[PDB]
């Protein structure tokens, strides 16, 4: 599964600076979703990849940023 990283507390995306390959997004995506995760910067938000199917991604039904 894939999807935008989301702050569980605030409901909002993680902003990045460098489009495409991005080590920040990479590390945050693995930390949140696990060592197998990938991630890159797409339209200036962190997009996580190789997520487990049950992974919770953006948007949170309840919480807008």
């Amino acid at each position: 599964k894939e999807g935008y990283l989301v702050d569980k507390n605030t409901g909002c995306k993680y902003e990045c600076l460098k489009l495409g390959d991005n080590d920040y997004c990479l590390r945050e995506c693995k930390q949140q979703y696990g060592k197998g995760a990938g991630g890159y910067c797409y339209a200036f938000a962190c997009w996580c990849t190789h997520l487990y199917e049950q992974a919770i991604v953006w948007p949170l039904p309840n919480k807008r940023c």
Partner: antibody
Amino acid sequence: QVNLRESGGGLVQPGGSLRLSCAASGFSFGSYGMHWVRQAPGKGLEWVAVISYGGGNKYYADSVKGRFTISRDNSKNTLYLQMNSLRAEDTAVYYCAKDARDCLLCADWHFDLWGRGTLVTVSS
Amino acid sequence: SNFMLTQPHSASGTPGQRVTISCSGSSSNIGSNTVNWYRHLPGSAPELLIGSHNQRPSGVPDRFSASKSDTSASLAISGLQSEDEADYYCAAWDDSLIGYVFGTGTKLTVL
């Protein structure tokens, strides 16, 4: 060969603070996120906190937020729970549990390893 | 009182026979996400009985069957032993609140 053991439990007055430890043996500590769960007297289990496998991200129960701070040392293979501004409602037995894997926000959470538990009591 | 999945206050059984422990819940926890089963032997470490879907390594005697239909889930214990009497909990991830919800707990007694 594999177990978790809690220490640091004790008796403390309100407003005071405690630090609980969990020693991990037999498995790779840094590959799994870790939880604190508690059982209050006359009640059942309640999930307290979680920290990611690398210690980067941590989530707390609404009850404990800002009072409790979860940390870990993957070099010493130990987990830490810092309990600040303690209340009488925080009286409980605390268990450190091991997440089956590394996904912090996921709907499949289950804890396949538990410790001996340590007794934290807060009296008037 | 935090929100909890609802289990019977107690269950009883006879040795070498079968007992069922019920876990009731709603959509956004059960009927959405998987359900887990733990057993807590008072004084010692709680144990993982079942999860996603089932069941553990090690203590997996079978004897322990995980069943789920929509909003209601159930654990089946077979070939009961005197040593089987412990508090039994169910747990499931609730979808909002976003978090991990524990059952009220069920004490089993072997006769």
